[PDB]
Symmetry: D2
């Protein structure tokens, strides 16, 4: 597509983390999440019955996709990527296949992904999706259960507390019944999807990885795919910073994702916001190396960009504009 | 007797709880900061009652647990707990017969917070006090404040001057008769023995109205000790305000004194306010007040899920450990 | 002078707090100063022999008046006011009358006020002076000793610890021997002085107040004088914020002084920096009411503008420029 | 015996001290932040030795008091104290015969910090350990690091590649023979019994040179327990690095283990780093390490006046109170 040229020149995007984890805001029964507040269910092994109950309290009165996209646009971000479903397995769109979602399970009773997809269409911002194709703590057969020999931002990679029978788990059950169906949903509704963001597989076959690639290719012909999916199945390489000089990308497309503070999900204890000058300088450094900066905002329980995140994005923009006048 | 006088003389330490619709905004409104006082946020931004009240539809504090809150208070050596029955925004945190603008009728939560705390205290053996905003009520067309705006606040005007912008056609008596006295009767009649009563310094309240509340409390709660703030003849202990603390003055004839503070700089929960007093500051202040025969009433602003903030709990518990250490050495 | 017109249009100035208190940086023997780190000697009643000993450690290797004035200039500040001598009584210039000064008492062995006066001359910034004409904790007969019935940011207003004989103290001794002589020094050397900043007298006669007024008028004909001096003896009223609407100034000249964090002097525990947006908005509000914003920087022990102060001034400038383009 | 082995098994808790020229910059250089590691600041900004060394002329820590530091350590139940004799910047914090780039010869202070701490520990009955950077030395033309820059650091290059930019003409042997071995002999001979010895993992040091230091320490300080970091045959306790802590691995044949941490995120003092671990975090970590037979070596980065930062002292003391409370309950 002309989508390859467009990504080469896009430079700057907004990432959005939002889900049930946002209501706990980095805190559980007087104890801190790790740096990663969105991992809180794994960190404290919160039973699905309890964690899911957060859905009943999810009523973000101040959520406004128009205002979020406007902010992104004012900062010169040319695209927006959003959590359709994180490791906890809660869909932030109206999933036909699973009622564990913002639309069916919450007083809010609205499709977040829908409102953001629309807001982007009208503002002329491309629209990307993140989806956790491997881990699903809500699914009896969610991924992670053949790869716990490594430490996480929680405890185990899988829901080992609600489903403590690793040897009687089968990821295929989860892949066939939830993963592929939900990927079809998000890739079919919500119009043109410019970017697709999957996790590095731990517990899914080359087949399953190839399957998602094909499903995305068929459904969203122009959709650029994050390297994390698999060694043959991508269009741009997501760089982790220590991979940047002073994973072959044949299209020459590169993205580095970061957050303004230290968490992806909202965390009221994390006030360690990168200063405007840090945000601007990092953006400048990545852009000069032909790397897109995908900068994460973790929306708060009322659906708001935290005050200091908004302030710092806007001040970073002012510094950039000032510097482009010289 | 009122052996309640002797008990207050020796109580030394209490928990205060601020909680209401303001807690959901958590010191933030449309990208902008509340003042140090997050509970004033409606006045600060002149949030129309229609919008602010809509917060009630989002109030579902899944983790609220009066037992756990009272247990914490008890573990820190606090002998009583005082709670916001209704703050300046005029939203009742109990099941008010007289006004449906309350936690029970207006919220998914559909529960009486004052009730659960009153019970939790009974069972734990902690006295139970009440705070009520008898003068300001931003929800009431004729709420107080509208004859006293010549002075600055933690918001804008003292009264709801935005929804009700006709200062010259306002009458507080309407509000006093229809909401204030009735609600004070409610909280002073239900929820059992009330050990402490906390009113604001009147701005827009006659001597009559002040005397009326005094009498109502005296009749309903014979042993209830009353905060000086109410009125110059109408109290049992003087609440001291920081600059009134030892190294005009209102006579305390019973010798009873209380200073209220917060752990951070806000009474209501505020995400942006992480300026928690260290355990050593909490302990030292408590010790200083207690040595001058002053009770320390220390405020916790519960978060939107009904939780004591992690750093508030940590700091209370560490302050307790320092105190115990010091009482062994 | 054309100095009246110039102040009406100046809008923005840098204030500098710096002295021995800066080395303690808000901390003494494991205990915190108040919000006002420069009050630390009074707060802990540090004996003059000990506090003065800080002079032996005062070697600010990174002090650079050119760089400080450049920053001020880049932020659009049109003048710079500096502590010649704060309540602790230590002169930050080469005082003939008292060797308790940066030049004579410190390894640094340099005139701070001199270097700043020069840097301002060359950059085309006006140059103002602050001087504590009443309190002097180093002087046996320093002020404050007839007015302790009120609380301070320390303990007593006077040095009541080294000199504990209030009834045998005589401020005239201090006024004649240190105050008037030092005011003559700072008002005679260091060239044109655009602004003069005295404290509200507690313990000095109408005579003594009139005397300083006259001395300034004679020495610095065009020097605009801060209302704090006395009810007949000023050119602009210094406003304290809660005095601003929604002290008659007949020239129509107004100044409000603030700090970026909560302290005037450097305080390593005070990281409560006003955000760029707060600084810019406050400046805008004061300027719209015809009030000059005098914004304080408390230099650190090495003579540096703290990193977050510099960042926040520069970002506030970028926001202002952005807003002036619209 | 070496009853020093039994003593380390039961010691549980030690104070580490970082202090040097880097402490005066306090995590800041020309308007810019050090990394999390303020002590790396010279490498981070490639500060020429002429300039960085000039900091020595400003080093006059009027409030340094080894007695008070050791007293604090003792009150927190720390049984030993380890100190930076010389960090990567190559500045000795003792009176080195072999190199005048030291606190005694180069600074107004004109005093041996290692000496005063060694004495203070003797009198208080605390063991005394030493840290020394045997490989990196940014002051030495032939300092280590110059054959291992393919990996990222808390600064820029591992070696001083800015003052000495001729990697291909550098020879570490020059540095080892003339500065490293001589200085290790100095610190291991003066300052009395040395209980603990802390070297960096070699990058640019032969087996010979590693064995040499081992032997030198063994000869000079028979009872000195040596940190695993030195070399795979040349140690007595394994220093565990966080991700090595229980819920390849190097065998500890004596069963001796140490984990070093800091209270905030820096080893050296940093004005901008106020991210102090809470007392409850300190206590819990100590408890967890101790239960797995691991000693907690907890670092304090002294400020330019030689002071334990106020929040470091507060947090150590509050952590102690929590520990004592928990050991009564």
């Amino acid at each position: 597509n002309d989508n390859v040229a467009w990504f080469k020149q896009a430079k700057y995007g907004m990432m959005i983390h939002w889900g049930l984890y946002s209501l706990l805001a980095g805190e559980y029964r007087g104890e801190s999440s790790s740096a990663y507040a969105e991992w809180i269910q794994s960190k404290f092994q919160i039973p699905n019955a309890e964690y899911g109950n957060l859905a009943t309290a999810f009523n973000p009165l101040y959520f406004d996709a128009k205002k979020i996209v406007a902010l992104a646009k004012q900062c010169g971000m040319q695209y927006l990527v959003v959590t359709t479903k994180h490791h906890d397995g809660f869909a932030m769109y109206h999933s036909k296949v699973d009622a564990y979602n913002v639309y069916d399970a919450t007083p809010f009773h609205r499709d977040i992904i829908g409102e953001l997809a629309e807001a982007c269409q009208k503002a002329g911002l491309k629209f990307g999706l993140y989806y956790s194709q491997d881990l699903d703590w809500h699914d009896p057969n969610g991924g992670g259960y053949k790869s716990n020999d490594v430490e996480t931002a929680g405890t185990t990679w899988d829901n080992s507390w609600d489903f403590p029978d690793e040897d009687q788990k089968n990821f295929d059950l989860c892949f066939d019944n939830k993963i592929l169906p939900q990927i079809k949903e998000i890739m079919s509704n919500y119009g043109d999807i410019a970017t697709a963001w999957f996790d590095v597989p731990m517990t899914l076959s080359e087949a399953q990885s190839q399957t998602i690639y094909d499903t995305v290719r068929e459904l969203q012909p122009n959709c650029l795919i994050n390297s994390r999916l698999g060694n043959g199945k991508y269009d741009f390489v997501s760089l982790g910073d220590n991979e940047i000089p002073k994973k072959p990308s044949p299209l020459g497309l590169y993205e580095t994702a970061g957050t303004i503070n230290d968490s992806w999900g909202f965390s009221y204890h994390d006030q360690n916001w990168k200063t405007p000058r840090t945000l601007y300088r990092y953006k400048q450094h990545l852009n000069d190396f032909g790397i897109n900066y995908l900068l994460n905002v973790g929306l708060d329980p009322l659906g708001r960009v935290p005050m200091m995140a908004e302030e710092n994005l806007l001040a970073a923009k002012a510094l950039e504009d000032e510097a482009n006048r010289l």
